[PDB]
Structures are given as C-alpha cells and as structure tokens.
Write a protein that binds this ligand. Structure first.
Ligand SMILES: [Cl-]
Ligand SMILES: [Cl-]
Ligand SMILES: [Cl-]
Ligand SMILES: [Cl-]
Ligand SMILES: [Cl-]
Ligand SMILES: [Cl-]
Ligand SMILES: [Cl-]
Ligand SMILES: [Cl-]
Ligand SMILES: [Cl-]
Ligand SMILES: [Cl-]
Ligand code: NA
Ligand code: NA
Lengths: 105, 105
C-alpha cells in the first residue's frame, strides 16, 4: 500500500564488505517500500514537491515519473572493522546504516 | 546516466491548484532523473544505506529494489494565492516547491 519501513537483513559478505567489517555478520538495515499515491496516510509528512510531482505524473504518466518511497532519516550501527593498520577497532556510531523513517520524495 | 536535476515546468491548472494559486501560471519545479548505479559520480554525496541497498539489489534483483534518485534539498517560490477570506495575498517563501539538489536515497 503506502510508503512504510519493512525488514531488510543485510549480509556484509554478500555485498563485498566482509574484507573490512569483521562483526556483526548481518544487520537489520530496513528498506522503504510502497506507493506514493493519493490519498496519502495522515501519519506521514510529505513535501510539496513530491505532491506536485505525483499530480503531474497523473496528468502526464509517460513524461513524468511518480515520487519515490525512500528513507528520510537514517540511524547508525556499531561495527567492528579492519583499520588501515589492520587491527580490529570498534566504530561505535557508523552513521547512515539503518532506516529510521520513510517518506515519499 | 546518473542522478541529476532536470527541467520540469509545472502548470497549476493542470494539477488542480489554480482555484487557490492566482499567480504565477507556471513555475520551474525541476525533477530528479537518472540511475543509482555503480560507479558513482564524485560530485554527489551518497548515503551508506543507499550504497548498501544498491549492492543488495545487484545480488538479489528480484527481492530488493535499487536506491531511487530523489530531491535531497528543496527551494521556495513566491505565490499569489486565494486566502480563506478570498483576497489575493502574497506568500513570499512557499517552501518545498523546487528542486535544489538531487541524490540517490
Ligand atoms: Cl491526500
Ligand atoms: Cl511522505
Ligand atoms: Cl515541503
Ligand atoms: Cl551510547
Ligand atoms: Cl563513533
Ligand atoms: Cl563508486
Ligand atoms: Cl547520491
Ligand atoms: Cl550516510
Ligand atoms: Cl528576500
Ligand atoms: Cl513567506
Ligand atoms: Na503522457
Ligand atoms: Na533475486
């Protein structure tokens, strides 16, 4: 239905990061999934440009794409990584790794 | 090619806003168009979650969508609008109406 946060468990080996991220093996990154269509749910905050673009898409669907459901706020995680020197070091707040909020943009 | 700002001229009559926005008739809203794929251009700032999701999409294309090219910063415009009382009033900075920057999210 509407744009919302859903589960996405990410494995660092599968994306080629295990050479440098020791632990954890996986983490919950989440993803934003769903449509950007009218009517909109009242528990989410849209931008005016996303509203305008969605309306323009309705009138000219071949020429203008619809707004996209994307992460609008991100949260950090902690990773145990391999530094340039190669020693296991803790990165306490590795920013931007997990979805906090979703929204149409 | 890559995610970038392109022209999108929006007509308020075409989107049903002319009942309340008197002037201007049209304005340059811009849109964000292009792909979110590796390698990425060095004149843009990606988020870690968008990078991770794009990598996961490559490994599992049917299960996880790619990051989306969206506006990451918006600019205001000035509109002459019809207030509840119905008198033409200037809104000097109507926020969020035009694309300032694009990015993969
Ligand atoms: Cl609505
Ligand atoms: Cl939204
Ligand atoms: Cl806005
Ligand atoms: Cl803490
Ligand atoms: Cl930290
Ligand atoms: Cl790259
Ligand atoms: Cl980007
Ligand atoms: Cl980030
Ligand atoms: Cl000014
Ligand atoms: Cl204002
Ligand atoms: Na069309
Ligand atoms: Na797949």
């Amino acid at each position: 239905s509407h744009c919302q946060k859903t589960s996405l468990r990410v494995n660092f080996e599968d994306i080629g990061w295990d050479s440098w991220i020791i632990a954890p093996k996986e983490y919950e990154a989440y993803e934003c999934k769903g449509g950007c269509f009218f009517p909109l749910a009242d528990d989410v905050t849209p931008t005016k440009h996303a509203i305008v673009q969605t309306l323009v898409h309705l009138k000219f669907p071949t020429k203008v794409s619809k707004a996209c459901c994307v992460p609008t706020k991100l949260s950090p995680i902690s990773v145990l990584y391999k530094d340039d020197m190669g020693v296991p070091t803790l990165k306490y707040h590795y920013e931007g790794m997990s979805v906090a909020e979703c929204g149409c943009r």
